[PDB]
Design a protein around this ligand. Structure first.
Ligand code: COA
Ligand code: 7DP
Length: 210
């Protein structure tokens, strides 16, 4: 028995404590790199919260057992100056992750897929406590966002998935792939950076039109 609730500003520390226990250690790229202490990822995770569309799953004792942190993304302005997230990151391991994200955005712009959309919901951080996995919590977190989308006239939910394993979860929820890149093909300086286990395959950007 659990609730799905809007994450409030007072929840920041608890959200970070939960992510440090799970996501920081068990998201596939983080585990592959052994991310360790990473204040930059704490900062990254806290950033979308004031957009008021991030959700927590909370058990009957009041403990956070899952989160889906979402932020609004806006179509780049006609005079946009594209910036690399990796350029402002001092943590070498997290820099590799941000560089991968920058590379994906350089190759694929979600706003090209949906020329009429000005605002798209971006699912940034999805994590569920191990003891509560396989119960559909990811789905219930995701579907709470549909409510926000309806309330605000947002049609598209965009979610970068870091493994085929998590892309499959989004597929079950009615998302479809819009871009993919194998880890074996990600060679920004001529060499492979990420070599996690074979079943992960690579990143898949997933989207749903709600
Ligand atoms: C991805 C993640 C959020 C899924 O959350 P979830 O609430 O367990 O999602 P689901 O209940 O839909 O379970 C997904 C699948 O995990 C498998 N599963 C079943 N029981 C499980 C358990 N005890 N533990 C782990 N996985 C289990 C099943 O294949 C299940 O699919 P199915 O129920 O449709 O057969 C979770 O695995 C997680 O936190 N992973 C690590 C962080 C991460 O990679 N986040 C996503 C980055 S894009
Ligand atoms: C929807 C989601 O949780 N995508 C994960 C993307 C991501 C974010 C932060 C990381 O440190 C990382 O390795 C991967």
């Amino acid at each position: 028995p659990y609730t799905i609730e809007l994450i409030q500003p007072e929840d920041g520390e608890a959200v970070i404590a939960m992510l440090k226990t799970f996501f920081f250690k068990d998201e596939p790229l983080n585990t592959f790199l052994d991310l360790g202490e990473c204040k930059e990822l704490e900062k990254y995770s806290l950033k979308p919260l004031p957009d008021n569309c991030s959700y927590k799953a909370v058990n009957k004792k009041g403990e956070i057992i899952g989160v889906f942190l979402n932020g609004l993304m806006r179509r780049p302005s006609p005079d946009d100056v594209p910036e690399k997230a990796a350029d402002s990151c001092e943590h070498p391991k997290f820099k590799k992750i941000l560089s991968l994200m920058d590379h994906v955005e350089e190759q694929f712009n979600i706003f090209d897929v949906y020329p009429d959309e000005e605002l798209i919901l971006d699912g940034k951080i999805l994590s569920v406590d191990t003891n509560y996995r396989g119960l559909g919590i990811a789905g219930r977190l995701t579907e709470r966002a549909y409510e926000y989308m309806r309330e605000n006239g947002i049609n598209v939910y965009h979610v970068l998935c870091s493994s085929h394993y998590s892309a499959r979860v989004m597929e079950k929820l009615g998302f479809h792939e819009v871009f993919r890149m194998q880890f074996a093909d990600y060679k920004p300086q001529g060499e492979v950076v990420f070599k996690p286990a074979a079943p992960h395959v690579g990143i898949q950007v997933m989207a749903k039109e709600v």
